[PDB]
Amino acid sequence: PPLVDFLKDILRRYPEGGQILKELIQNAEDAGATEVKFLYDETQYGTETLWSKDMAPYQGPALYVYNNAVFTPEDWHGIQGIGFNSVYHITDVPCIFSGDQIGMLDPHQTLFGPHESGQCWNLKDDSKEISELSDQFAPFVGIFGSTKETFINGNFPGTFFRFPLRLQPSQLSSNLYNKQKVLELFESFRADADTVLLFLKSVQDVSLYVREADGTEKLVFRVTS
Q1: SS3 state at 38
Q2: Which of 55, 58, 80, 210 is 20 to 30 A removed from 43 (C-alpha atoms)?
Q3: Of the candidates 108, 112, 129, which has an alpha carbon nearest to the alpha carbon of residue 3?
Q4: Between the CA of residue 216 and those of 41, 43, 48, 140, 206, what are the distances in Å?
Q5: Which residues contact 25 (CB under 8 A, 6 or more apart)?
Q6: Domain boundaries, the chain
């Protein structure tokens, strides 16, 4: 059972595209986060200074998810009920930024090498490479308080994910996400939000946003317990 086929089957067996939203809230809860933010970002990034040209399909609109906890080493090991794997409903290349590290997962095992299932950069140890790959890392600044100085100094005291939305079929999935389909996820969560927060004791605030192409931000929904 190869990784891509395994995941493909899991996504067929657990078809609800929205599970990653409740799943990430649960993970934030376990981590002792007190707030979670979801943001649909329409921003298109450049495709020049990437790890490789094969990264270009992942430079467009993305769902971001923030929480105010920092990953432990164990959290990173865990990341690298179908758990995190529901993310693959919406993206082929989930990205994780927490503390001093950014990771990108690649179940296709094509982007980083035929023996690699992903890649990690340390903001300090790999600072030169990051700076070289400015288009690759631009999507990790200017959101949730991450600034250029975050990368210069090398620590972001929180967690966020970037899930570039699937715009063409892949070996994982035929399901494409656009703004409409992401807003459908947001509306479905909105319906269930009081029930989700019901049993949580750490996460007390969940908010959903859109950042438009011109940079304008719209509050879609916010729920507190």
Answers
A1: strand
A2: 80
A3: 108
A4: 10, 11, 25, 18, 20
A5: 36, 196, 200, 203, 206
A6: 1-225
The residue type of 208 is L
What are the distances in angstroms from CA 66 to CA 16, 25, 36, 63, 220?
21, 10, 5, 10, 16
Experimental method of this PDB entry = X-ray
Tell me how far apart the alpha carbons of residues 104 and 81 are, in angstroms, rounded to a whole number: 22
Quick check: 219 and 209 in contact, CB under 8 A? Answer: yes
Q: How far apart are CA 101 and CA 35, in angstroms?
A: 21
User: Which residue in the block uniquely carries the two structure tokens 């270009």?
Assistant: 56
Question: Which residue do the tokens 């920092």 mark?
Answer: 70
Q: Which residue has the tokens 């080493």?
A: 73
